[PDB]
């Protein structure tokens, strides 16, 4: 495991066997959707909306209640971001490292980490082009990356 | 093993382990044959009348012979609630 490390950690979530909403859950499939859109306009990514839902609203899974996954609901309401969230945070981290590197030119460790992040961007961007999430001519440019995320 | 006419051309049909069903070889000197006496309703051991189990030398070497007898004897009624299937 760990594509870009020697780690073998297994920590992750373990979904319950039950695919139905808990008996104590009382919100409707609608009230969750308006809650998601309300939070989506505040700028939260699908990961953060799901964290807030279970943390403060008791929504264990948006799928077991609404019937669709969170990103599927946003894309159905024209609220899907242009760049996928995970690709956005990889590019944003690469932007931060590249900005740090120009002021710290002897930081050869940051140069090594930057190659890993950018290699991770290209593998993910290439995948998104085959599934037609990104345009076939979409290419990640290091020079113009700051425009996309900043 | 027998031929076409049905005669048992096999010599030495070997014994098999009671725990693992492995064949106990002719020179497996770690293998034993447990003989356990039958007890009548008076609490007396019945002379020359036994329950017999065989263990291969492999099972005994790993130290699992004791736990295998606990299981085998409990299924035959020689023991009660000493070996548990679920751990």
């Amino acid at each position: 495991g760990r594509m870009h490390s020697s780690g073998k950690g297994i920590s992750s979530s373990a979904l319950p066997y039950s695919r139905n909403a808990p008996s104590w859950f009382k919100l409707s499939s609608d009230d969750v959707v308006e809650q998601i859109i309300k939070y989506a306009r505040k700028g939260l990514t699908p990961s953060q909306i799901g964290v807030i839902l279970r943390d403060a609203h008791g929504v264990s899974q948006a799928k077991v209640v609404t019937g669709n996954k969170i990103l599927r609901i946003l894309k159905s309401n024209g609220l899907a971001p242009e760049i996928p969230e995970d690709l956005y945070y990889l590019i944003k981290k690469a932007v931060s490292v590249r900005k740090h590197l120009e002021k710290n030119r002897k930081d050869k460790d940051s140069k090594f980490r930057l190659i890993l992040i950018e290699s991770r961007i290209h593998r993910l961007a290439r995948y998104y082009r085959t599934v037609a999430v990104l345009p076939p001519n979409w290419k990640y440019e290091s020079a113009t990356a700051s425009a996309l995320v900043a | 093993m027998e031929n076409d006419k049905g005669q048992l051309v096999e010599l030495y049909v070997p014994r098999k382990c009671s725990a693992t069903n492995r064949i106990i070889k002719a020179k497996d000197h770690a293998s034993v044959q447990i003989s356990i006496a039958k007890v009548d309703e008076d609490g007396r051991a019945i002379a020359g009348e036994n329950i017999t189990y065989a263990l291969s030398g492999y099972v005994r070497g790993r130290g699992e012979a004791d736990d295998s007898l606990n299981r085998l004897a409990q299924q035959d009624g020689l023991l009660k609630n000493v070996w548990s299937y679920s751990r």
Binding site: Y17, S18, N20, S23 | -
Partner: protein
């Protein structure tokens, strides 16, 4: 008018006659006007009882689920020695052959595996399934085991045997229902 089928049988009319009688008490009346069903399949189970299967349009299933716990109890009173279950009439689409002409991609809800799992879920409605196991016996036959939650167990705990034969009638396979966490 309650029956969504042309030429209903006498049993369907009697059941719909009950359906036009449970709204008399206003605690459950605001919801029995739209309720309809397609068929009433009935089979004989051992012990002198008879299994009554009410078939419901799948889109109408979630409306029945809101009052099904109550509605069955009075329907079991009106028809004695009857075990009442509510099933949705899901459609099974056959697996396309290699030479078969291309059709629209078959949704998973229309697959035979999903439908048998779905009717296996509608059978035990008040309880929820917490685990399923399939035994493969040396004889060649295969037996399913479904484990049910102890919550709301009293609604089904005296039946289950009706479900096993009813499931066998519908699919031809063997299933055994067990509630591992009872008080016992």
């Amino acid at each position: 008018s309650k029956i969504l089928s042309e030429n209903p049988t006498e049993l369907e009319l009697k059941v719909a006659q009950a359906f036009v009688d449970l709204e008399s008490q206003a605690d459950l009346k605001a919801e029995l006007r739209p309720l309809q069903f397609k068929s009433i399949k009935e089979i004989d189970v051992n012990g002198g009882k008879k299994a009554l299967a009410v078939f419901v349009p799948p889109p109408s299933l979630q409306a029945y689920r809101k009052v099904q716990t109550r509605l069955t109890r009075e329907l079991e009173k009106k028809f004695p020695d009857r075990h009442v279950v509510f099933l949705a009439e899901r459609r099974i689409l056959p697996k396309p052959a290699r030479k078969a002409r291309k059709q629209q991609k078959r949704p998973r809800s229309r697959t035979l595996t999903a439908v048998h799992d779905k009717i296996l879920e509608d059978l035990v409605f008040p309880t929820e399934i917490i685990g399923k196991r399939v035994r493969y016996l040396v004889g060649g036959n295969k037996i399913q085991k479904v484990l049910l939650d102890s919550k709301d167990s009293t609604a089904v705990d005296y039946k289950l045997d009706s479900f096993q034969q009813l499931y066998s009638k519908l699919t031809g396979k063997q299933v055994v229902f067990e509630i591992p966490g009872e008080s016992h």
